[PDB]
Design a protein around this nucleic acid. Sequence first.
RNA 1: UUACUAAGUCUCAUGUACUACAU
RNA 2: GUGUAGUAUCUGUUCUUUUCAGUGUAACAACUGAAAUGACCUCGAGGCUC
Lengths: 144, 83, 220, 92, 29, 173
Amino acid sequence: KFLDEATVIGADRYGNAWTLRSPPECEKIMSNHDPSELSNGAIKYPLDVITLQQKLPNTYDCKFKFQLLNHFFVNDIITDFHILDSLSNSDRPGCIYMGLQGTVGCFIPLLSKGNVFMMGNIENIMAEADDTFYLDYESRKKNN
Amino acid sequence: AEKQRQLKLQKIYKQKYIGLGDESTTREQWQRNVRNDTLNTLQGHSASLEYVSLSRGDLSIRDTRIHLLKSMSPGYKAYLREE
Amino acid sequence: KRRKTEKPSLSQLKSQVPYPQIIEWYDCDARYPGLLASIKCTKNVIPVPSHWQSKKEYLSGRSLLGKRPFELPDIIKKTNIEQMRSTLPALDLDYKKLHDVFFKIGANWKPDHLLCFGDVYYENRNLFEETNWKRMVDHKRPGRISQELRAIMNLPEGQLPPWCMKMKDIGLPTGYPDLKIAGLNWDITNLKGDVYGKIIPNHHRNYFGALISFETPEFE
Amino acid sequence: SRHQFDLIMCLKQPGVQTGLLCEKCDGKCPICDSYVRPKRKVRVCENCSFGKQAKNCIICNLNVGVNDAFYCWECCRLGKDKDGCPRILNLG
Amino acid sequence: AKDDELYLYHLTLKKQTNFVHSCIGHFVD
Amino acid sequence: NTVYVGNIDPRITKEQLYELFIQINPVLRIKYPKDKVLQAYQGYAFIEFYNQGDAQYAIKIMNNTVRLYDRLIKVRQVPIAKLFIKNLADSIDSDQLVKIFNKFGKLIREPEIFYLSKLKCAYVYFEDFEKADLAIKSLNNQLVANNRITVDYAFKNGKGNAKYGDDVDRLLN
RNA sequence: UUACUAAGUCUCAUGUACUACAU
RNA sequence: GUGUAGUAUCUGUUCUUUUCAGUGUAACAACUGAAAUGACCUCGAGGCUC
């Protein structure tokens, strides 16, 4: 699916849920140029792109590359993505997916930063939390 | 000494993890490892197993699983041919 | 012997290949050439760096002699420790200053060059010149001439370049149809300083991820 | 080991038992010999325990260890934690 | 410059329904 | 595409060339050599544009235009039949050779007169392998200026192979 | 207007660092 | 400010049996084996040469 003009949602046969984005070097070119000049006609590409065309024609044949933007693994196989401008009137537009083995889940873009800073810190806590319990339980065994 | 240890660890890792290309490995030997691991994961995840079951359209899902298991051995092609 | 002489010609191998120009003469002795051509010519694979088959241990480079020792990232150079400690042939610093340099000042900061998906560094390569190159394709644009190259050109202020007259007879640059230059397609009274012309574009978001706020972690 | 090359490992399926290391070797991740943020206690196969040899330091193979060896968080992510039974069979 | 860097928050609203394993024991009283 | 530039002051640098020619057209690449015997610049560069249209444009507008360090900047844009003939007469002029071989075929260049052993011989360049076959067929072992001349292919071993007819046919095409 | 690549092996000397080992 | 053993690295120097076949090599390199002697022609090259 598309979230936007420049970004794409995709799933995998193997369960990866990813989102890609066209590079700003490409967005400037397509924003500043007409598509008719891409196939034939004059479009001025920076020196590196062409050197990647003669150097690596197989990968860079399409002359740009998606920088990985979001990547995730949901063990299911995602059947349907849908981008909803609002979920029950909520401001942040979400994208909800139904998996094949069955599931429905969402990816909510986080506004600001300290949202994802606090969330990131909480996830970091719960990540090794089992190890923290094990090290405390270890120290108390050193004292006992 | 060091490389000589890497030979022994080559024997051990090859024993545990089966196919590991050492230096010279025939395309028949290595591609077999490819097929075996791909089928291994297709049947290994209940997810992808459920997926291949429907896309293939088999009557039951375990038919697809044991199909992949059978498909791991080379002679299974001729086996299907003899049905 | 027989297997060494059994090899198909590289041009016989080209036909099997969708991107035949990657295959090279040494692929003839590939033990599985039909396969190696498919892998090497597969879409996203990145060919082996070519410094193999050279015995120079990958760096003999004459260019290695002339490489700069190091340069601080300008954001870190702001921290002034450059003056506090002389690395070239004590400096009390503030925790808030250093912490803010990495976080407050330098959160959005990223190295300017980096590299791309298939970029591989060959011995003779030096990234720095390509960094000034990419930055220069950015700053410098037609219609503008720096005062240094202007002085070397011996062009006084207020006077058009010598190719404006031949550009009057020949016409505007085929590469720059939207280019404007004083005296011809563009107002001479707008001639100022180093800019004798500018391209006038004839063309005239949030990307679902717009954060709308930026807040870095505070040290205190 | 990571540093001394001739040291040979075990690499069998680890059992329930926990390997011991001496106070002299205390703090080393038996693979990388790192002192930082240990995670999971080492487990050795029964073939490396049995009698007196069980008391030996799984690292230096000589001294009798009191302490348990833990893998670091870098080896636990590299998976070398689960590779097999770490032990040093030859003294080196 | 604003960093794009889309930050996604994953939630499982409804949890995987294809039941691959079972056991007959008596666990809690 | 690529243009040669010359009469350049070694003090002219790469950024200065780039900033110079971007004023004319977009510049794809610049190869501006740096001497490993003088550790500087040898005073001529190569500017590869995005096409021969902008290349030729820059050749027309740029040539004899910009003055850098008082020195003017210059811009410049960047397989046939051969018959050995032996025992020629001393009275045979190169122009006479031209007249003799014109009737058989058009000459891409002028004959080359040289002396072996005393022995006057010449190389004659034909644009066509078949016309060369004509001058061979008629002029081989013939008496001109009361002297017997031999006409065959010159060595490269000698011209006139099977692949030679094939590729020379194409170069004619 | 010059469209960008050279040392290798051997021999017998010079240049410079270094490693165990002893007063 | 010394001696014993030993190492590495420059630089200088120089091109080892003309060939064949095998190993070897990505191809080289390198290694392993043998050996033509005589005559002639044109400009070190060349020979359906004997």
